[PDB]
Write an enzyme that holds these catalytic residues in place. Structure first.
Site, PDB file in Angstrom:
ATOM      1  N   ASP A 217      11.020  -4.600  50.349  1.00 56.61           N
ATOM      2  CA  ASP A 217      11.819  -5.587  51.073  1.00 56.61           C
ATOM      3  C   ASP A 217      11.808  -6.921  50.329  1.00 56.61           C
ATOM      4  OD1 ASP A 217      13.230  -7.079  52.835  1.00 56.61           O
ATOM      5  OD2 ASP A 217      12.007  -6.607  54.595  1.00 56.61           O
ATOM      6  N   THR A 218      12.903  -7.208  49.620  1.00 63.09           N
ATOM      7  CA  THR A 218      13.063  -8.485  48.937  1.00 63.09           C
ATOM      8  C   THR A 218      13.244  -9.652  49.899  1.00 63.09           C
ATOM      9  OG1 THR A 218      15.464  -8.186  48.736  1.00 63.09           O
ATOM     10  CG2 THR A 218      14.083  -7.326  46.958  1.00 63.09           C
ATOM     11  N   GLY A 219      13.511  -9.389  51.176  1.00 67.13           N
ATOM     12  CA  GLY A 219      13.689 -10.436  52.157  1.00 67.13           C
ATOM     13  C   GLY A 219      12.424 -10.899  52.838  1.00 67.13           C
TER      14      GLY A 219
HETATM   15  C1  NJG Z   1      14.061 -14.113  57.865  1.00 68.10           C
HETATM   16  C2  NJG Z   1      14.809 -13.132  56.941  1.00 68.10           C
HETATM   17  C3  NJG Z   1      14.496 -11.673  57.333  1.00 68.10           C
HETATM   18  C4  NJG Z   1      15.065 -11.372  58.696  1.00 68.10           C
HETATM   19  C5  NJG Z   1      12.963 -11.474  57.342  1.00 68.10           C
HETATM   20  N1  NJG Z   1      12.590 -10.054  57.630  1.00 68.10           N
HETATM   21  C6  NJG Z   1      12.627  -9.087  56.475  1.00 68.10           C
HETATM   22  C7  NJG Z   1      13.903  -8.222  56.620  1.00 68.10           C
HETATM   23  O1  NJG Z   1      14.035  -7.385  55.511  1.00 68.10           O
HETATM   24  C8  NJG Z   1      13.819  -7.390  57.896  1.00 68.10           C
HETATM   25  C9  NJG Z   1      12.749  -6.292  57.788  1.00 68.10           C
HETATM   26  C10 NJG Z   1      12.836  -5.396  59.055  1.00 68.10           C
HETATM   27  C11 NJG Z   1      12.202  -5.864  60.368  1.00 68.10           C
HETATM   28  C12 NJG Z   1      12.293  -4.981  61.619  1.00 68.10           C
HETATM   29  C13 NJG Z   1      13.016  -3.636  61.556  1.00 68.10           C
HETATM   30  C14 NJG Z   1      13.652  -3.167  60.238  1.00 68.10           C
HETATM   31  C15 NJG Z   1      13.564  -4.046  58.993  1.00 68.10           C
HETATM   32  N2  NJG Z   1      15.106  -6.732  58.065  1.00 68.10           N
HETATM   33  C16 NJG Z   1      16.017  -7.072  59.184  1.00 68.10           C
HETATM   34  O2  NJG Z   1      15.699  -7.833  60.035  1.00 68.10           O
HETATM   35  O3  NJG Z   1      17.284  -6.417  59.171  1.00 68.10           O
HETATM   36  C17 NJG Z   1      18.089  -6.434  60.362  1.00 68.10           C
HETATM   37  C18 NJG Z   1      19.641  -6.574  59.848  1.00 68.10           C
HETATM   38  O4  NJG Z   1      19.917  -5.356  59.344  1.00 68.10           O
HETATM   39  C19 NJG Z   1      19.118  -4.363  60.237  1.00 68.10           C
HETATM   40  O5  NJG Z   1      18.468  -3.552  59.539  1.00 68.10           O
HETATM   41  C20 NJG Z   1      16.875  -3.729  59.881  1.00 68.10           C
HETATM   42  C21 NJG Z   1      16.777  -4.511  60.928  1.00 68.10           C
HETATM   43  C22 NJG Z   1      18.070  -5.271  61.013  1.00 68.10           C
HETATM   44  S1  NJG Z   1      11.270  -9.869  58.744  1.00 68.10           S
HETATM   45  O6  NJG Z   1      10.820  -8.479  58.879  1.00 68.10           O
HETATM   46  O7  NJG Z   1      11.645 -10.281  60.111  1.00 68.10           O
HETATM   47  C23 NJG Z   1       9.986 -10.966  58.018  1.00 68.10           C
HETATM   48  C24 NJG Z   1       9.891 -12.410  58.519  1.00 68.10           C
HETATM   49  C25 NJG Z   1       8.846 -13.335  57.904  1.00 68.10           C
HETATM   50  C26 NJG Z   1       7.933 -12.805  56.810  1.00 68.10           C
HETATM   51  C27 NJG Z   1       6.916 -13.733  56.191  1.00 68.10           C
HETATM   52  O8  NJG Z   1       6.238 -13.040  55.186  1.00 68.10           O
HETATM   53  C28 NJG Z   1       7.728 -14.890  55.586  1.00 68.10           C
HETATM   54  O9  NJG Z   1       8.815 -14.348  54.855  1.00 68.10           O
HETATM   55  C29 NJG Z   1       8.045 -11.367  56.296  1.00 68.10           C
HETATM   56  C30 NJG Z   1       9.093 -10.435  56.911  1.00 68.10           C
END
Ligand code: NJG
EC number: 3.4.23.16
Lengths: 99, 99
Positions: free
Chosen positions: B25-27
């Site tokens: 996860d690059t996000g």
């Molecule tokens: C703020 C930017 C993003 C939102 C941040 N997130 C990463 C992001 O990749 C999440 C991962 C995810 C979470 C839950 C279920 C599936 C995938 N994907 C996500 O929300 O996707 C949405 C839209 O598309 C759909 O598919 C999957 C879900 C829907 S996080 O998990 O909330 C996060 C917050 C703070 C930190 C600390 O370390 C500081 O960064 C680390 C991680």
């Protein structure tokens, strides 16, 4: 380009004729942008993340340019903490992970 | 290897003597793992995403193997719906975004 990950992969996008910054987010299925005005029809939807679910407006078939690459796809607009570009658009610009 | 983004970039990881599936996860700045009873000290932390914040436990200097690539760093443990490999460890395995 090749993007290393020592810093957040933030890039400039163009949508609705306006420039914005957004995060390339391989962990997101979908693309979610912060509150904004977009032309055309939308539909209310729900999307879930790490902390629960939010209401979003779903815009389909939206033109969006990402770091100089064009995509046309679904854009969700709502109270996301940051603009995130998800896989639905990352695939269109040919983005892959490599190691 | 090269991973396309047609589907979620799930890979097998090894941590605390357990094998698990996790997102590259690059996000995510940090690595977030489903609840597991790791030994050692930890510090409370809160991280925010779509839907709001969750409470997690921060463990430091944790050994973790990602697709046979070894890494060591901080892992956050809490009620996340998915295991998330963040940039703090993606950089250690040489992961880049390419388009
Ligand atoms: C703020 C930017 C993003 C939102 C941040 N997130 C990463 C992001 O990749 C999440 C991962 C995810 C979470 C839950 C279920 C599936 C995938 N994907 C996500 O929300 O996707 C949405 C839209 O598309 C759909 O598919 C999957 C879900 C829907 S996080 O998990 O909330 C996060 C917050 C703070 C930190 C600390 O370390 C500081 O960064 C680390 C991680």
């Amino acid at each position: 380009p090749q993007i290393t990950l020592w810093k957040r992969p933030l890039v400039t996008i163009k949508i609705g004729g306006q420039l914005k910054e957004a995060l390339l987010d391989t962990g997101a299925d979908d693309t979610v942008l912060e509150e904004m005005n977009l032309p055309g029809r939308w539909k209310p939807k729900m999307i879930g993340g790490i902390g629960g679910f939010i209401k979003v407006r779903q815009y389909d078939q939206i033109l969006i340019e990402i770091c100089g690459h064009k995509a046309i796809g679904t854009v969700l607009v709502g109270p996301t903490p940051v603009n995130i570009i998800g896989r639905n658009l990352l695939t269109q610009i040919g983005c892959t992970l490599n190691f």
